[model samples]
Every structure is written in structure tokens, then in C-alpha cells.
Target: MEFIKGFTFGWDSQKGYFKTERAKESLRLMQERTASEYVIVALAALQDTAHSTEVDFQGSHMVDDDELIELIDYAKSLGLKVILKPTVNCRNGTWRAHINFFDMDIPGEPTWDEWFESYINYQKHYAKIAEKTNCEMFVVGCEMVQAERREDKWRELIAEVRKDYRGLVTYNTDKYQEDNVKFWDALDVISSSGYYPINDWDRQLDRIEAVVKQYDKPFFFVAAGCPSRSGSALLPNKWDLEGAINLQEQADYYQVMFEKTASRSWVGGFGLWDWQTYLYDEKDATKNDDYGVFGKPAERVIKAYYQSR
Candidate 1:
């Protein structure tokens, strides 16, 4: 529940990504440049497709346990608190939020029951690692929209994870989904993605505030950022959005986001969209158009806000 001035790092990185010098320097620069006191180390657990029953956490696409532990240890050495987020993704290019199955179990098809069982096992594996590494929080999943309605399954998953991890637990619902989740009471914090449009903060935060009051839980944005492109401020959640390079637009988005959220005392803090495993040259930041803030105007905005807090 502490103020999480954080950036998500090494998300879904492949094996040995963290072992490289670039990766180490990336983490160092994230802390030094952004004044970040916390980091969310996100690893991806891949399933063949959204409908597939099995969750694969031990695949080659994931970082080896030793490397992940070393990364966590390194972050802690620099006085950064860690949030261990083991999230599920689909191999077939579908969004995780769309991952779903039939409400009722048809004889030959996969069922919600099957998916939850596999998911609980996937969660349990990382929960132990989070406990062992002393990660301050454990994010159970990220932005699984269709799956949120399976309230009992989510509660069960949280319960299973608690057996291994003894820290704050949270789930990262997607933007505009703060009120949709039925199981907020089961978690230590209520968090969601904060990708609201530039002009939508007042209305969106108003709605989310009601949910916070209703659940009486601490809240934060697990991920929130805009790409440095012309239209990104209006559609911050759109990863594939195409437009001209506009560093000011991204910085403006961050400015408005922080300004609006500042007065809302219940809104704890943010883990901004991401920082890269390997950074591009600072000179090229103006040309890059992804969610990363490195060396961009948004980076300066973030540093000023994070440092002031």
C-alpha cells in the first residue's frame, strides 16, 4: 500500500535477457532517471491460445529462475521495492483480456474449471518465488477482462497463491474496468490500468473513486502511459496506434494524468507502462513510438513528478 513510484521492467523477456550488461544498465537508468522507488518485474506465462487449458510458465520464452532472482536482488540492492507480476498471455496474438471459455462445460470442450486449475498452478509457482525473493507485492494477473466475471475461480486462485506468498496481493484490471470486478475484497489492493484519454480523467477517476469507497481498499494504477505519437494521448491504450512522432503529446498526457490523480488521496501511485530491457540511444528517443519513456520528454515529466512525490 506504499506509494508505488514504479516502472514495469523486463516484461515477458526471453531467457538470459537479464544477464546482459544492457539489461543491468537499463534497470539502473530506470531508477536513476525516473526516481523510481519501486519496480514491477513482469514475466509472461504463455498459453497456446486464449481458449487453451494449459498455462506454460517454464517455456523458453520466460526468464530462467536464477536470472529472475538475480534481477530482483539487483533491484533491491539499488533500494527499489519489487512487485512480482506473473501474467498470462496468448501465443496466437490475442489480447489477454479476451481470453475466455464457455460459461457451461460442453462435453468435449475446455471449461472454465479446466483453465482455473491450470492457472492456479501457474500462479503458485511464481508465488513461491515472490515469497522467497521478498517482493513487496504479487500481481495475480493483468487485464483479463472476460475472465473477471468468474468470481469464484478468481477467489480460489487468490487463496491458492496466498499459501505460498505472504505479501500484498493485487489484480490489474484493464482501463475502465475498475467497477467490473466482483472480487475486489479478496485482494490487498485494487489496481487497474490507467490508460484513460487525455480529456477523460475527471469522469473516469470519479467513477473509480466510487469503487474504491465501496470496497474500502487501497488503489493504484499497475500500468499507465502514452506512446510518443500524435494520436496516442487520445488513445493511450492503443499499442498499434499510428501517428507522427509527438513527444509533447506523451508528456502532456502524463502531466494531465498526474495532475488529476494528485488530489485524489486514495489513488496511491503508478507503475508506468514500461521501461525496456535494452534501451535505444537517447538521441533516438524522439523517433521511437512505443510505450517506453526512456530519454523522451515523457521521461522528464515522469522524473519531475516522481521526484516531487
Candidate 2:
């Protein structure tokens, strides 16, 4: 059976975060364990702001472009192909304050014309970086469902970006909106975050089967989060065990999804959500959850699954 042999890792240096020795060890372990051929390491040098509604680059949060280049070069030294995913969202703000405007209409702030211009400009920046780094794949957008209906603008953006980076271009959609296949015609491949909730992984194959039947297109998956909580730990939902089960269950779902999707003459590859967990201070760490298999037996399980398949 055909399967994906790649992994996606994120390295954001703008949020006062830097790649450390431990993080390097994690990547090296993944390279050795998964034997993944394609690794897209995202160096997100986002604007920082505390208000969540505005973008800021004050203090130590501003990412030096030189440092970003160094990080990309470091990832390449590991013998992995890298894809740069530069985002416009604020790093230190809430989702509403960052990407989404809470006070705006259902489609939200930035009228269609305004959004089109901004997105095109963002793509221009990505193209510039891609040209400099010679990265193969790029994510044009992520989980902005409201903005997707502007297909004419996206088509033009892709056409323009193609002039710079002669590689695959894809947009990452939210979990449920993966069926919006109209954009596939304009893109080289279909890509989406595969966080289908903890419970859905067990039956995720059914979802894939249903979606694949509608469109024949190559696709990529980026799974995110485990034991997802709404607000506070006190009101925590005990889906941790279920989430763990689903995490282990990814191997099977991936194999099935790949086999079924590829059989239809579409579906190129798959990529996991993240490679390592982010670091936080003691006070903040309490709110963060461990998602990486690094330093845990689950890493072995995931590595074994990939090798065995």
C-alpha cells in the first residue's frame, strides 16, 4: 500500500521562541525514526502584539530575517526538504484579535477587495522568501474559510506566485471545510489541517472516503492538538485517553486514507501537524499540553508504525 513518507515541523522565532538543542534532537530523532523524505519546516516570523487586535514588533519579539535564514539552513543540514509558511497573524494575541475580527460581519472585517489586496501582498512576500530559499512547497493560506469564496483573487494570486516559486502551492483549510474543492483547480494540491476532533480519528476513513469520491485531487494533511480543551483545566473534558487512542490510531487512518484516496488517481502525500511542543514559562506551561512523541514511548509507537507500514 502507498503511504506518506514526510513530516511537517514548525519553527517560529518571532514569539521570543528559538530552536534549541532539545528541539534539534527531536528533529534528528524524527528523521532517523520516521525516515521521512520530505520535511517542511515553517519559520513563522510573525508580528507580535499583546492586544490581539493589532500587530506589533516591539521588544525582543521582532524576528531578524538573518536569524530566520539561519534556522532554515539548519533544518536543511538535517537533509530534509523545507517549505516556508510565513503567516500575517499576530503571534501573541487571541484568534479573534489576531486573524479574525470579532466585530465584523459573518465573513468578517476586510471587505472582499481589501482582503484580496492584502492576501496578494502576503503571497508576494512568500514568493520572495521562496525564491531566496528555493523551498519546494508553500502554504498560501490557512483556515480562512470566509476568504475562500474569493476564488478569482486566489487564482490570480497563485498565477502570480507561480512566476516566482515553481513548486507546489496549497491552502490549509479548517477540518470541516476540506470539501471546498473549487480552489483545487487553481492549486497544485489540496491541503488542510487534519484535526478532526479526538473521537473522529477512529472513523476518519469514512470521512476521507466521502470526500475523495467528490473530487480527484492530490492532498496533504496536518493533524493538530490532542485533549483539546475549551477554556480552563477545572472544566477539563476527560478526552485525554480518547485523544491518546486517536493519536495511536493515526497510522491506520493515514494508511487507509492514502490507499483509498490514491486509488482514485489523486492524493499525492500527507504531513503531520507538528514535530515538537512549544516552550512556556512555569506559570504558562501549566496551561500547555504535551503533544510531541519526543521523550515518550509514543514516539517509538509512531516510528514503528511508519517503518512497519
Candidate 3:
């Protein structure tokens, strides 16, 4: 609500991940340094294939529902609005974006019907929890590139989520795929991953602005940030590009990014890609090369931007 000054956390963390004091420490750091107003607590459901299928969410790596409620309460006590963002991952290590199926059902291979059945169940489970816990938002899914085209299924899912969670609902499409979603009207907010190239923020923001206007919805980047690695700013989307430590580069990127987009009224805000369940040695902060902004120059840059907002 406060322009969603946010940070996403615990995406890759396992069940019971936030039961430690470490998470509370990170949240305090986020609030004190970044002036964060929201936290998107990620819940991951696992599937066996990137082919529009799953072994059900029974084997999910997502935080247990009870754990999530506890974390949400703690976050709210810190004055952070919780965005319960549930994401799906392929257990075979495939990206969620590649999860696909034929337009029409194929014999014996699984199809959209079966996939959506499982997905809806997965979503409904969290929707109930989100309602019970009073989350500020519910992200139905994230970057399900291959599945976004099914307008009716998405509509049904949104409607189903509405029945359970009365809060605002949104979906986090992948970076650059903001305009591809036909169901933006069904969501209260339009969000996406914002790992755009450092030099191309203007062009990408300009492109995304048009989509935001078309949908006539509030918009924000639910996930956006770079690792403290050399050259990460140039191609922020590449998570595997591990390189030399250059803390200044990460800080500079955040500064430049906010400088370019902050003045745009249409730019709702950003949820910095991630923080973590636990932190590395603070003494070795300069030697780190992940997106975590802790103990780095970028943390300072973020705090300045957030406070000014």
C-alpha cells in the first residue's frame, strides 16, 4: 500500500525455514536499512516435470502453513505487510517458465485439464491460509510462462482464490513477459520479475508502462535485484553468472535503477529480488556474490531510496 516498499524472502528456503531467529534478524535489518514496508514470503510447490504436471504438492518444499502464519505474524509486528507468494518449481530442476502442454489434451501424456486440477488444489490450500492469516496479498503463481495463455483457467483460479482470500490478488509473471498475460484485468495488481539489464531499464520500464496503462492497474516489480558480482548489472537476469566481487557495482545498479524509475508515478515500487532465511558472515560481505544486499553498499542505496519515498 505504501508504494509497496518491499523485499522478497525465503524463496528457496525449505519447510520450517523461518522458524529461527535468523529470519527475524534479517527482517529487522531490512526494516532498519531498506525501510521496507512489505515482505513477499515465497512458498514453493514442487512438480516432477516442466511439462504441466506434478507429483501433487504433497512433496512440496514450501513453508508449512503453520510456519507461514507464524512468520506472517512476526512480519506484521515489524510493520511489514505480507504478500503470500506461492510459486511452483519443477523437481527435475526445470524452470517453471518451461512448464508446457499441448493446446489440446494429448492421449496418456497429461494435459491442461489435469495440470490445472492439481494447480488449483495447490492454490486453494494457500488461499485458505492467506485468508486465515490476513495477508495483504496473494500471488497466485509466478512466471508460469507456458501456462499464462489459458485465460479461462487463470480466470477460474482467480475466482477460486477470491472465494478464499478476500485480500488483493496478483500474479508475478517473468521478466519481459508482462504484456503477454491476457488476464491482467482479473488481478488487482500487475507484477513481474524486474531483472532487467542496467542500461536498459528505461527502455524496459517504458515498455512495461504501456502494459500497466492498458490494464489500468497498479504495477510493481515483485522481484528485482542483482548479485554482488562483476557484470551482474549488465545482465541481471543471469543468476548463474558468478564472478568477482564488486559490491559497488551492485549498489550502483540499485541507485541507477531507482533514479530512473522512481519518478514515474506509474511505477508502484519494487520487491528487491530476495533476502534469505540466514545470512553469511558479515565480515566476508565484500567477498559475497549473491543478490542478498546485506552488509553491502547496496543496502545503503536501498535505504536512501526507500526513506525518500
Candidate 4:
């Protein structure tokens, strides 16, 4: 059967650090080259520090309101559907960590009510932008699996957000925790980061099939990146650009995952893990290469997959 073709592309403007000519050109190239129909611009303004302060909550690093609106407008100009993914995980400094639910005392950590309130406020800020720019999809949260069971809070949060954003809402979850499927009823659609063990690459299709059967909902997958030899639950400490698989193998791996996902009636779509090459130039940088498929052999594989579809 001829499958419906789609690609997931987005921009991660890290506060405003990497908003250089290179970044803009890279984003333009991604929009120009990929077959992705929906683009989720991840506007992460939160700082990556342990000290949780009001400044951290403000997302000062990402573009300001006006610039963000401009980004949405630019994506729309490219004839792509825009999804605003104002990720809370970025603000809490959990993107690189294991995201411990019990460790609530850390900087920027808030009570459940505070977290929900902040999330709602962030949505409010983005809602005005979405409304003005006509962006349709919004990712409320990304990969905060520990808190997925807060059904009542999510219900209330969705209701409050619906007041501002008249678009779809979904949450991205960690790869291993499919129990998050319970939230399937609460969200508009199901989204998860599909990071299986590289050692089990050959069996990934079967594993994905099991996940789809469990949720039985429209789902999305963000492929995993190469981690250090030491396997941790968190994202790989660094990006392995010129490592074992090379670009072609990386792209082919994703192609296999996407093909299997699209084969299922319940699976809605899939997205690449990261949009741009991020710099983890900190004390403990994990993966050493850029996670983006741009400029890598993975790009060609993605193009081939799109054409096949």
C-alpha cells in the first residue's frame, strides 16, 4: 500500500544563544528540504541552571514575544502547519537529567499547583501568539512521564488552555513508560519519544508494534540519539556525530521506525528528536555530536523515505 507521507520538523531556539546566521539558514534549509507537514518550533526560554528563579520561568533565553510571533509567521509563510511546543521540561533543567519526580526541592521546582499554574501561564503567553499567527497545534508538555497521571490537573489545565488555544494538545513521554497511555483519554493525541536500545535495533519494529497495541491511539515518535557506552535513562550525554552508525545508518534506523509506525492505523505521525545541533559545552557534556538530521547523511535517508512514501 502507498503510505501517506509526512515529516516532523521544528526549531529549538535555545533562549537566544544560537540565533545566528547559521541557525536561521539551517532552519530555512530544514523547511525547504524535508517533507514534514507539521513543524513544532520549541520555544525554550528557561535557563539551564539549578537555581529556580522567576527569571528562569520567564524563558528569557528564547526569543521574545514579538520574535516568537515572527517565527510562527515565517513557518506559516513556508506553507507548513506550526505547532508551538513551549516545553516545561526545558525550564526545569530536566532535559539532560533523569527527570526525578521525587526531587521536587531542586531549583525552579514548584509544587504541583505551581507547576500547573506556570504551565497554564506559559500556554496563555503562547496562545496569544498562536491566535495572532494562526498556528494550529501546541505541545503542552514534553516527556514528563512521572506526572502524567495527574488526570484532574491535566483536565483542568486543558480546559484553561482551551480558553486561549483552540488547537490540538498533546504530551511527549519518555520511551520506556508507555503506562503514560492512561493520559491518552485526557490529551487530544498521544506523543512519545521512541528511544529503544541500540543493541535491539533489529527488533525495534516488533517493540513499536507492541507499544501501538498498548495505547491504541494516534501517536508520534521522536527517534533516539546515540548515548555513551554507559546506558542511562536520560538523553545521551552528548551527540555522536561521526560515531559508529554514521549519518546514513542513523537515517535508515529512523526510516525503519517511521515505516513501522505509519503502518499502524493508530499511529498518527513521527518527529525527529532534535531540530538543530545543540552545544552542550558544559562540565559534563554527554553526546558529543549534533542530534539534528540536517547536514548529515541522515538527511538523505529521510528524503528517500519521504519519496518512498
**RMSD to truth, every model:** 0.9, 6.3, 1.4, 5.9
Ranking by TM-score: 1, 3, 4, 2
* Candidates 1 and 4, the one with greater TM-score: 1
Compared with the true structure, what per-residue lDDT tens digits does model 4 show for residues 18-125?
445555555567665566656667655453332332324344455666656655676677776776777644445456223223335455554556555656777677
Q: In angstroms, how far off is 187's CA in candidate 2? A: 0.9
Q: What is the TM-score of each candidate against the true structure?
A: 0.98, 0.69, 0.96, 0.74
The CA lDDT at 81 in model 1 is 97
C-alpha lDDT score of every prediction, in listed order:
0.92, 0.54, 0.85, 0.56
Query: Across residues 1-309, which tens digit of lDDT does each residue of candidate 2 receive?
Result: 134556766543454344456556656766786666566655443443322233232346444555556656766897777666654555554331124333333464444455446556756766777778777678777666655666776788788788878876777776667776466777766766665543344465466656755665566664332322232111112224332223334333334434444454333455654564243333432333444334334445456545644
Q: How far is candidate 3 from the true structure (C-alpha RMSD, Å)?
A: 1.4
The Cα RMSD of model 2 versus the native structure comes to 6.3
The segments of candidate 1 whose C-alpha lies over 4 angstroms from its true place after superposition are none
Off by over 4 Å in 3: 55-60
* Number of backbone-clashing residue pairs for each candidate, in the order shown: 0, 2, 0, 15
Please tell me which model should have the higher TM-score, number 1 or number 2.
1
- Off-target runs (Cα >4 Å) in candidate 2 are 1-3, 15-23, 43-62, 90-110, 197-204, 213-216, 224-268, 277-288
What digit string (tens of lDDT, one per residue) describes model 1 on residues 65-138?
Answer: 89999999999999999999999889998999999999999999999999999999989999999999999999
Candidate 3 residue lDDT tens string, 74-178: 988988888988878777899888888888776788788788888888899889988988998999989988789998999999999999989999999998999
Q: Residue 189, candidate 4: how far off, in angstroms? A: 1.1
